[PDB]
Symmetry: D2
Subunit: 395 residues, 4 copies
């Protein structure tokens, strides 16, 4: 990504004359009803209603088709399904491939809403879920059951940032259960720093809410599938009514155009911050995929073409409630909020016992408060000064 | 509705200073991340994350909260869940209340995507679906099984327009299965011409895509629940990631403001067209809830406060493929498209055997082509002239 | 029929591309595939070929076509708001040494453009009473270039006798540019160009947008005046954004149903006020006895919802607050044309100050109402509660 | 630091209401709860209190604060596009009998506003070479009111010596209004007001929007000039819609990262072109030897991506088509400032026609490039393929 290999593709993806009609960007076609001039046109649209002919707004307008083409090009897929947000993409992509009696095997570092979908929705529909440590690698083979239908990856993991050995996991799954559907939540890589479908994963899911939108002001999920899995994903998600509005689709395409320049800055700035934290006396551990020594760093170095700006670190103590407020309430530049992927730097704390509660069948291996940072586009020296002032409030 | 009882409420619904901030309409707050100024604010927002405190964009921003308040006021509910479209609202509202082993009882005149969700998604998750004639009334009692969890109504029915006797259905359900969840797709009434929750229905679902948006350019679903069912609907829909974007929420609130004036014109114009069709030698039957003699008209007259503009009629013959094109391809004012509820008049044909295929366990009682009209805001004499020219093409 | 025309205006496949409404094409840069395509676009840069976003995109072209159809014009120029349309449409037709005649009931920003901008640029403005009719001929000077009408007038609602004014202007100065601010009629209740007016200007902000949430001006010109309007407004950089253009087209579709309700409700309110013991006068074009009512009935095809009335006394400051601060449905705000009912007050001397070279003929406090889409009986109850606070 | 300021500019809780970005408040009417609130809003109608949508809503106020911070001004007026900002900012400060001095490299619509609009309103315009520096003093007349700069110049990219120009103006006419079209620098690579310029104008359409899909003008004035700019632009009805204001604020947030890439890529392309046998001259402010390069290096903190070069021959019409019609990555279009690379050609006489009272000093065909965000080696390959089509 630092060699800027993808910048031309990002500028051009999805932009064909039939969508752009003379402008640089696609038109925004807001529609439910899509008009058929003739019965013959209606027949053709019906036959091709999932193949990019205008049929009905739930299937998409020109604006959606342009984004779908862009996502398929950038992630190397056969089709791209769109959803109201990342969590809708995760829940509905899993649901599209399960039936009563099936089993899902999910990394224990999966985003908490993804886990809760499995334990609170799937379980009562007769679909069981089991868990694996993110560094399990080839030893995942022993956890695959005869009814395992879906293997769900997330690399780096949520909050704690562990990087999977995807080649080892995929090879083991294909040896034991070649027909399984392997999915990944590939949001941290923005789908482009880790080419999931080139690794033999079947479906790459993103919260496009994060880096694709890139400005903290739009929510949208995507799922890019290979040819084997596309039709089932497309049609079963459609039966759940999943779609995104045309305007957000436009804004997602628009975010792609600056994604390379943004990601390079997030990488540079966040790694500098991580390197400083890693030498700091008030820091016990830094979890940054690009930082040597972080969990799965060797796999990040081998398998990814760059880093984004989200990472975490563990303080040298667990902050009490009072210390947590003294720390978090008084930052000048970092904002406290959920989500990430924008221009604004963000800070979010989790206590060790909070993380343990969202690591099913596992324990945490740290005792300090875990601080997750999203490093935005501000000057990195200003961000470091803000972090230093925070440390002085809790020293 | 013709007495304009609701016009003031429609103008004012959801408009409180905290949402409007000095303007007439609510602000549009586009957000994923929502910032917590302090740990105390984060705690309060977390506790109240489903109760209208800013927490995270998936739960909503000020713009969503304003629409939700408006919908609860207008439909008399405890809460309103928002979805990417009507079909998402139907599928996810049903899903929110079922588990493996349950049974759904659905009118055989339900919108086809609603039926297909049941037969193609629910069945493989261990949830069975049975069917009932829309005029079954009190005799629905005999179809309720010990595992019937959901009774799903749609009045008027899709395409064929049959009106249920909701009081008789509800009373029978409550006598046999008082805990059942009774739902209705109340799109044709725009949630306001039929006050479903006052009839003892638990959840009123709409494709807000239709009359609430009112302009054929925005897609959104709503589900307004009573206090008994709200928390389950809210939390289970949230686990599926269901939401709508802030801009569409704004446009839905904005559509409410003209809904009364629009519906009165749709009623006037469509009933005039229906009355003319009912005397026409090339028409076998008119299906309009407001037309005396139409199926369930007596229930429409008793239970509804007005009509919208969607209805259908049966031609005196089945048009061949060639005649269908001669008829439909040459209208000057009616456009051929799916959906309805806008300012534009629309025409859509279904052959009798097409309808039979979407009437599970039932047959049709007509043999001519079924023409569905959405009567928009054009001058009714111009619409009549367009229909007359169409008749001359097939006489 | 107007309702059918409103639904269909501007909607051609090259703009709608399969949807009911036009696409929204957001653009500055518009791409030319070849040198020849660039030459063709340049030739057609004001004629609906994509050239540069300042001229417009498909979305603008669709709105412009709609406005030309509905108002019977050769072209429609777009502006950021109504005040920009007024100021720039007048400016487009004047130069040092010219004279503008303007009704003394013109919207106050229109007047202030003339006195604060035009005068120092060598363009003089004279004033006339809105009921002058044929006697305007006596005010036409050798250098009169523009005659600027506004019917009904701002706030006080006087309706011109447009046929008499136009005939008198054409007898003296047939080449003069006659303009009207036709906002109250939404350009459709009064077909200005059919009366021989050259340019019909609107604050599309009002009833065309219809929801109090978008600002835009329009000016529809006949064939004689279009090229000068188009090019001189373009030299001032005047345009509207594509999204507001889309919303204006969208507003047209419900304009008929909305206006009929505004007419029905506002005439009922006016008739009730006229009977009320605390009301001295009602200024509503549709109310019998109102100034120029006979021209409204003859020349218009309906009414909108904006009008005013004069109280039977001059409110003190305490009474003004007791009255205005405690309404339940009417909101105090500027503008009008939306679904929300609005109220504003003016003392007589406030109006006299914006009636150049004239005095007012009333002494009570003037109340301007915009009658929105609420139930009229609820609005009447709100007005009655207001009367009780000041009786 | 600029990057931190860009991320944070204009973002205060009263505009953001809990989100990262400002709310979008779409409004004409703004409601007053009481008479007192209306009086307060009226007093503060240009000072960030909600009064009427033509003045702005929260969304506009947030952008205005951001622009004032970033450009170091007392106020920021908003306009429908850059050309509207130029025309209306000049118009705000002139009257019959005044004189404008303008660089002969000004954007052509700016010149045409002066010759086609101002002249007939009694305001004369004289011209100067962009490298005139201190010798501009000899052109200042007793009636010179405005001095209008554009650095770098349009198309040909000449950089003024702003310190020398400003000092010379202030020696003769210290009260003159010095304005600059600061679009190329995005208002942030050249801190115009810190140099003693009174008003910095931008086509925010370019790098502030940054995506070729939104049009808007800005003008940031010092304390001495703000009230006249604000009020006179308002009398012309100048405003931008709330949504475009939001998108402009949003564009600011990535402006630093974008500009650094445009600088890196465009300087690499310029350096390569300068070595190329088919290139006579490169006009890039950052390239050594370019006109006024020493002032760019001294006075600016970076470069953007727009520049031009002169071919070693005058292309025939056939060669122009062979060259321009067959690019794979560069698009032919007007405007610039986005992620897309753009190309346009001008013959020398086309430029001479827009250099008033001057001739050009080249005879080859001039090519203007906007260098976008594509990989620079891909752009170089596209340029090389173009050279091969005309060698
Ligand atoms: C890896 C991942 N996958 C999916 C989602 C859900 O995406 P949506 O919020 O539904 O668009 C998120 C959201 N993350 C957050 O809010 C947070 O980490 O604080 C995510 O991190
Ligand atoms: C009664 C009803 N319920 C739900 C929906 C789905 O709503 P969405 O399209 O997903 O927003 C529709 C849509 N109707 C159509 O398109 C049509 O009848 O042609 C409907 O009629
Ligand atoms: C007749 C007329 N012409 C033009 C405009 C200006 O339109 P813009 O506000 O610039 O879009 C208005 C606005 N009216 C108001 O605000 C008000 O009467 O309180 C108007 O009444
Ligand atoms: C220096 C400068 N100043 C103002 C404007 C006008 O800005 P607007 O187009 O009205 O927003 C432009 C536009 N440039 C172009 O289109 C082009 O160079 O091809 C400009 O370069």
């Amino acid at each position: 990504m630092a060699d800027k290999h993808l910048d031309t593709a990002l500028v051009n993806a999805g932009r064909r004359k039939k969508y752009t009609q003379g402008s640089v960007n696609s038109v925004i076609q807001r529609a439910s009803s899509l008009v058929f001039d003739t019965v013959e046109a209606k027949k053709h649209a019906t036959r091709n209603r999932a193949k990019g002919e205008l049929f009905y707004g739930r299937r998409g307008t020109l604006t959606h088709f342009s984004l779908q083409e862009a996502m398929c090009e950038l992630e190397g897929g056969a089709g791209c399904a769109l959803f109201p947000c990342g969590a809708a993409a995760v829940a509905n992509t899993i649901l599209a491939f399960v039936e009563q009696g099936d089993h899902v095997l999910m990394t224990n570092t999966a985003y908490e809403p993804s886990q809760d979908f499995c334990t609170k929705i799937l379980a009562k529909l007769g679909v069981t879920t089991g868990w694996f440590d993110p560094l399990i690698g080839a030893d995942i083979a022993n956890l695959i059951q005869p009814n395992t239908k879906v293997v769900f990856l997330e690399s780096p993991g949520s909050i704690t940032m562990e990087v999977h050995d995807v080649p080892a996991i995929v090879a083991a799954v294909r040896r034991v259960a070649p027909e399984a559907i392997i999915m990944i939540d590939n949001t941290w890589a923005a789908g482009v720093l880790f080419k999931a479908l080139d690794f033999g994963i079947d479906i790459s899911i993103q919260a496009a809410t994060k880096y694709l939108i890139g400005h903290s002001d739009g929510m949208i999920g995507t799922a890019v599938a290979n040819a084997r899995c596309w039709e089932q994903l497309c049609e079963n998600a459609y039966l759940m009514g999943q779609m995104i509005d045309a305007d957000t689709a436009y804004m997602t395409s628009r975010g792609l155009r600056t994604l390379g320049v943004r990601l390079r800055q997030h990488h540079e700035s966040s790694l500098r911050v991580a390197e400083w934290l890693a030498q700091h006396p008030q820091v016990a551990r830094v979890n940054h995929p690009a930082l040597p020594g972080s969990k799965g760093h060797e796999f990040w170095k081998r398998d990814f073409s760059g880093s984004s700006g989200l990472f975490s670190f563990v303080l040298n103590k667990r902050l009490t409630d009072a210390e947590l407020a003294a720390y978090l309430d008084n930052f000048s530049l970092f904002s406290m909020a959920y989500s990430w992927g924008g221009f604004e730097s963000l800070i979010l704390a989790n206590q060790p016992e909070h993380i343990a509660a969202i690591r099913p069948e596992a324990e945490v291996d740290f005792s300090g408060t875990l601080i997750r940072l999203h490093i935005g586009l501000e000057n990195v020296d200003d961000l470091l000064a803000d972090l230093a002032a925070g440390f002085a409030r809790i020293v």
